[PDB]
Amino acid sequence: ETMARKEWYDVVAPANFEKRQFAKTICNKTQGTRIAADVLRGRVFEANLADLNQSAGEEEAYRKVRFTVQEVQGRNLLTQFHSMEVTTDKMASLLRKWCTTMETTVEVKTADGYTMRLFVVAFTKPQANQQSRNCYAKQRLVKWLRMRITKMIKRRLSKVQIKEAVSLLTRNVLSDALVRRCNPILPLRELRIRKVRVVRTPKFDAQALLSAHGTIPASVEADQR
Amino acid sequence: TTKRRNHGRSKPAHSRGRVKPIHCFNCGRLTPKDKAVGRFVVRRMLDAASARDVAEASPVYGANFPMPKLYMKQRFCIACAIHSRTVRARPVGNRKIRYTRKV
Amino acid sequence: KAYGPNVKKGDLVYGVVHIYASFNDTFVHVTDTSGRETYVKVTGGMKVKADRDESSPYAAMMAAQDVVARCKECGINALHVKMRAVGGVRTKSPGPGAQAALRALARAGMKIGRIEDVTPIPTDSTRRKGSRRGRRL
Amino acid sequence: AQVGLIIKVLGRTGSRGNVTQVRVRLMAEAGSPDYNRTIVRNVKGPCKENDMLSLMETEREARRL
RNA sequence: CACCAUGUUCAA
RNA sequence: GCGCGGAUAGCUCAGUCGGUAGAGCAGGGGAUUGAAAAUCCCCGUGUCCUUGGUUCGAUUCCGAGUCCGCGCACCA
RNA sequence: CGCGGGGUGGAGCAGCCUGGUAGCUCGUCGGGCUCAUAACCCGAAGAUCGUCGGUUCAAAUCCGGCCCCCGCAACCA
RNA sequence: CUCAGCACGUUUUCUGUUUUCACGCGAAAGCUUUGAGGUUACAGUCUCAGGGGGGAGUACGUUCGCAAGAGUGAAACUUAAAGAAAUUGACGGAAUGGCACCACAAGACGUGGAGCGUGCGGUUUAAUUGACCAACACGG
RNA sequence: CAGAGGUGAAAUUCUUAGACCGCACCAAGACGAACUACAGCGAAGGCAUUCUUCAAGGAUACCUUCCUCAAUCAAGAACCAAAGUGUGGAGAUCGAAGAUGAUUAGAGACCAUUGUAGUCCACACUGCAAACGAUGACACCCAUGAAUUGGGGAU
Ligand SMILES: *O[C@H]1[C@H](O)[C@@H](N)[C@@H](O[C@H]2[C@H](O[C@@H]3O[C@H](CO)[C@@H](O[C@H]4O[C@@H](CN)[C@@H](O)[C@H](O)[C@H]4N)[C@H]3O)[C@@H](O)[C@H](N)C[C@@H]2N)O[C@@H]1CO
Ligand SMILES: [Mg+2]
Ligand SMILES: [Mg+2]
Ligand SMILES: [Mg+2]
Ligand SMILES: [Mg+2]
Ligand SMILES: [Mg+2]
Numbered sequence: 003e004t005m006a007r008k009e010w011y012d013v014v015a016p017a018n019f020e021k022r023q024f025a026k027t028i029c030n031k032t033q034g035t036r037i038a039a040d041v042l043r044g045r046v047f048e049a050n051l052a053d054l055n056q057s058a059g060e061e062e063a064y065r066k067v068r069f070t071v072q073e074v075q076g077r078n079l080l081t082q083f084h085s086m087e088v089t090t091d092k093m094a095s096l097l098r099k100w101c102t103t104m105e106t107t108v109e110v111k112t113a114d115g116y117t118m119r120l121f122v123v124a125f126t127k128p129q130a131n132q133q134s135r136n137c138y139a140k141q142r143l144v145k146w147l148r149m150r151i152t153k154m155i156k157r158r159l160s161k162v163q164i165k166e167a168v169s170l171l172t173r174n175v176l177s178d179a180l181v182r183r184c185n186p187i188l189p190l191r192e193l194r195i196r197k198v199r200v201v202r203t204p205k206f207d208a209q210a211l212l213s214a215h216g217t218i219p220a221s222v223e224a225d226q227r
Numbered sequence: 228t229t230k231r232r233n234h235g236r237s238k239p240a241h242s243r244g245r246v247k248p249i250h251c252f253n254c255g256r257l258t259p260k261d262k263a264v265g266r267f268v269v270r271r272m273l274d275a276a277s278a279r280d281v282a283e284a285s286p287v288y289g290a291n292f293p294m295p296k297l298y299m300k301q302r303f304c305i306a307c308a309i310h311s312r313t314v315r316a317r318p319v320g321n322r323k324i325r326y327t328r329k330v
Numbered sequence: 331k332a333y334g335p336n337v338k339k340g341d342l343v344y345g346v347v348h349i350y351a352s353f354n355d356t357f358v359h360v361t362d363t364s365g366r367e368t369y370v371k372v373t374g375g376m377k378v379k380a381d382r383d384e385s386s387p388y389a390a391m392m393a394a395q396d397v398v399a400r401c402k403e404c405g406i407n408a409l410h411v412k413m414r415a416v417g418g419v420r421t422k423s424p425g426p427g428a429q430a431a432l433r434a435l436a437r438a439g440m441k442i443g444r445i446e447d448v449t450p451i452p453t454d455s456t457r458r459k460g461s462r463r464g465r466r467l
Numbered sequence: 468a469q470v471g472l473i474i475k476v477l478g479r480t481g482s483r484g485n486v487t488q489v490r491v492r493l494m495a496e497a498g499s500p501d502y503n504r505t506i507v508r509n510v511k512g513p514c515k516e517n518d519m520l521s522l523m524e525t526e527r528e529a530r531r532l
Numbered sequence: 533c534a535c536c537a538u539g540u541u542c543a544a
Numbered sequence: 545g546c547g548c549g550g551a552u553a554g555c556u557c558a559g560u561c562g563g564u565a566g567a568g569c570a571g572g573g574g575a576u577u578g579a580a581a582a583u584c585c586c587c588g589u590g591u592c593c594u595u596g597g598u599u600c601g602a603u604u605c606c607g608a609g610u611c612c613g614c615g616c617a618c619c620a
Numbered sequence: 621c622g623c624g625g626g627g628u629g630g631a632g633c634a635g636c637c638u639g640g641u642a643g644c645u646c647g648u649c650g651g652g653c654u655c656a657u658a659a660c661c662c663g664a665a666g667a668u669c670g671u672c673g674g675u676u677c678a679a680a681u682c683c684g685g686c687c688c689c690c691g692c693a694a695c696c697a
Numbered sequence: 698c699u700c701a702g703c704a705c706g707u708u709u710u711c712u713g714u715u716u717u718c719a720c721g722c723g724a725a726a727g728c729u730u731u732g733a734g735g736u737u738a739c740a741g742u743c744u745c746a747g748g749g750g751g752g753a754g755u756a757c758g759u760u761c762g763c764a765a766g767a768g769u770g771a772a773a774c775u776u777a778a779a780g781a782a783a784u785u786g787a788c789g790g791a792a793u794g795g796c797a798c799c800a801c802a803a804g805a806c807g808u809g810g811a812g813c814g815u816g817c818g819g820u821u822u823a824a825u826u827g828a829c830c831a832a833c834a835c836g837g
Numbered sequence: 838c839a840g841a842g843g844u845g846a847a848a849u850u851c852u853u854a855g856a857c858c859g860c861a862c863c864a865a866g867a868c869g870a871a872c873u874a875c876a877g878c879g880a881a882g883g884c885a886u887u888c889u890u891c892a893a894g895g896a897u898a899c900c901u902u903c904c905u906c907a908a909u910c911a912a913g914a915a916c917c918a919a920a921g922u923g924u925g926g927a928g929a930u931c932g933a934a935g936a937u938g939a940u941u942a943g944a945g946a947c948c949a950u951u952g953u954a955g956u957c958c959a960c961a962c963u964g965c966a967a968a969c970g971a972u973g974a975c976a977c978c979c980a981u982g983a984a985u986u987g988g989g990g991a992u
Contacts, residue, residue: 245883
């Protein structure tokens with residue numbers, strides 16, 4: 003039997019999220035020369051952002067968030083933000099044909115040490131009274147849409163920590179403040195941070211990880227039935 | 228006998244020299260991107276009989292939260308478009324009809 | 331009898347089912363939501379004896395019922411679903427077994443979470459099999 | 468085998484026209500899970516609507532048209 | 533999208 | 545001549561460790577079909593290499609021996 | 621020449637019960653499908669096992685003498 | 698703040714890529730300020746190529762090339778048409794809509810196997826006196 | 838954990854020494870999807886991520902300057918797709934040759950699995966395209982209505 007050697011573990015998000023305990027998993031019992039706590043401590047857990055903050059509205063429903071395992075406290079897998087990505091169904095529906103599509107990539111080094119790319123996509127719109135056939139854009143103006151986005155993310159997310167930066171990427175605080183400043187350059191149908199990835203990490207500090215979870219919600223699977 | 232002005236493709240005389248080809252969607256034939264007939268399909272994943280079974284067994288999906296779909300942009304060879312009946316041979320007077328949007 | 335985790339009878343335990351339908355064979359593969367742990371993988375070529383039936387939707391259905399039989403034993407009440415075609419440089423349209431595999435999990439009482447298509451799409455392509463003239467039939 | 472009622476005849480199908488595409492309502496016992504369920508199935512033989520027939524595996528649906 | 537090659541010489 | 549494996553219908557081959565043979569495949573029929581190949585369903589068919597001790601009952605347990613493989617032997 | 625190999629249905633080749641109208645592919649026949657031919661399908665025919673003897677209940681096989689075909693060798697002064 | 702900014706709306710105008718639309722033109726297909734128009738009412742300027750189909754872009758000569766080749770480029774001989782665009786038809790293992798028990802389907806009852814009757818072929822014979830779905834119990 | 842692959846059906850091929858699948862990652866080389874169109878740029882070949890750079894190019898604006906400097910071209914020059922060649926790199930994927938499957942009467946083909954040269958870069962060579970708009974260049978006149986790209990001007 004293969005489920006005879008499996009132990010159920012529970013995956014906790016950081017303190018940003020409403021549903022802390024998501025995505026119950028398995029792993030082998032320890033044989034003795036290989037421990038479960040080392041096999042688990044690099045895994046990546048994909049979860050929808052609408053299944054975490056417990057407040058949908060079809061802006062959170064179309065983003066999933068990945069978490070990477072840092073520390074193991076018994077049955078809890080203490081994780082940290084790995085990546086966030088707009089789902090592939092929402093992203094392909096945003097393209098229309100006759101407009102134009104700008105794609106910027108900005109490299110951000112947070113004040114904790116996490117280096118990240120953010121991959122912003124933008125789309126032009128026609129005006130309300132516009133009778134034109136296409137509404138494309140000047141390539142002078144898409145390079146200043148791109149210059150202002152690159153300047154504004156490297157300034158807002160280089161002061162902050164990593165718990166604050168994920169709370170900026172979630173909740174659309176960064177994105178809404180990035181539409182409003184980049185709409186007087188070009189008329190924007192949609193500006194959406196498409197995916198963000200943690201690229202490089204600082205060296206593992208244990209006290210900085212436990213601070214990032216608040217109070218751990220105390221799993222129930224080191225148990226009797 | 229020039230069968231069609233524009234010669235089958237969206238390139239006029241003094242505009243482009245060439246356009247780099249794409250592979251056909253099922254044949255894999257390399258045809259130029261402006262020549263090859265291109266359809267953007269918005270196909271649903273499940274039939275409405277099959278989707279009703281899945282939406283009923285779903286905590287997420289219902290009449291409020293619609294189910295996703297496939298968005299793939301097919302591009303076909305001209306041999307491949309006739310045979311799959313994406314496109315058909317039309318009468319001589321009827322060939323100049325051009326559709327700017329999906330009907 | 332049930333190697334499930336420690337919850338009540340009502341709670342939903344999620345895994346992720348990875349439906350992979352080609353035009354040659356359909357796969358139904360249940361993982362843990364990290365992918366690093368596999369509960370059951372049942373393919374459509376284990377249900378039929380002829381190779382032409384391995385892609386068919388009825389073999390996808392019987393493979394989908396063999397999954398639900400074991401996922402109840404492992405204690406998995408609900409599933410997220412990631413469907414895919416072959417993708418990459420290839421045909422990117424889902425096979426015959428795809429929609430009948432998914433319907434047979436809902437019909438068998440497995441609760442269905444969030445449907446997603448994760449077919450591999452390139453930002454630019456390697457050269458595809460077959461010549462400049464393509465496959466000729 | 469469940470007994471279903473033909474509520475609609477959708478036309479003669481197949482190559483030779485011997486198979487008939489119908490829409491069959493399943494007619495279960497009204498407290499059941501699969502009550503008032505309608506399926507689109509292929510019937511072999513002369514079939515008019517309101518004709519009951521027995522079904523071996525009701526979880527299949529035929530591909531329409 | 534299984535396989536499906538060919539029909540002597542003038543003349544009417 | 546030492547240890548390992550192989551012997552089970554025409555071909556092919558897994559065995560319940562001492563309670564009776566199985567699938568694979570070929571050989572005769574209906575089905576598919578308008579005619580195919582493939583696919584199906586249906587009726588052949590092996591004293592289970594030779595011997596014993598014959599455990600309630602030996603393809604299965606066990607003692608020799610013929611046959612066939614590999615890797616090893618070796619002073620009339 | 622010594623020595624070595626084989627002669628088998630019209631063609632080319634097999635043949636381990638010592639033995640199946642001896643087997644295989646092709647061809648020849650007779651019927652189909654086709655407007656017609658080929659392909660294809662359903663059938664049936666055709667062997668002095670080169671020849672003479674001998675072993676044997678039984679010989680293509682086993683032992684021979686012959687007729688052919690085809691090579692290997694055919695040496696050193 | 699790449700900000701006295703960005704996009705749009707109505708209208709002008711220059712340059713570019715085009716489209717369905719007046720003359721006119723063309724053997725026609727078609728072309729049409731983007732000419733194939735302004736041409737027997739035949740002259741704005743310059744330039745390159747062609748002279749029935751072949752042989753043949755061959756042979757020789759020469760110049761380039763590492764080579765493959767490239768540029769230049771004949772003749773003997775041979776032929777009564779080769780072409781071009783359209784029309785009408787016939788045909789498609791091209792779409793689309795129909796139909797038919799001399800088509801299938803779902804079936805029936807048989808023919809092909811046997812014996813005989815009769816017609817046809819062949820073989821015989823002194824002689825065994827049209828037709829080959831739409832010939833073969835037919836020329837009553 | 839028991840098959841994947843591939844096809845019209847298959848079989849070559851991979852697989853209990855763990856294939857296929859699933860997750861995160863790494864390496865290497867190509868290539869820049871959708872947006873991408875009777876759109877732009879370029880003398881033609883041709884050119885599609887981004888950012889920092891180098892020299893240019895046309896159009897437009899102008900009451901700037903110049904003052905016939907022009908048009909077109911034998912000879913002569915420099916570019917010129919893909920394949921090909923030489924010398925070094927690279928070698929991921931597709932893949933002439935070749936090899937195995939299969940289909941076939943035959944299959945030297947199409948189809949499946951592979952696989953060499955090539956594909957890609959540097960520096961040389963070649964100069965062979967349906968190099969097309971099957972339409973030489975430069976001027977002139979030329980009716981109409983939607984649009985479109987860049988510049989300028991009115992509101
Ligand atoms: O250079 C132009 C010329 O001077 C003038 N004869 C004009 O002809 C038309 C004009 O056609 C164009 O319609 C276009 C709009 O759909 C317009 O283009 C213009 O668009 C404006 C908005 N973007 C301008 O900003 C833009 O610069 C400009 N290109 C016109 O050019 C019609 O609009 C009139 N109704 C009738 C005129 N005869 O076209 C010349 C260039 O095409
Ligand atoms: Mg070209
Ligand atoms: Mg011939
Ligand atoms: Mg007679
Ligand atoms: Mg084939
Ligand atoms: Mg290959």
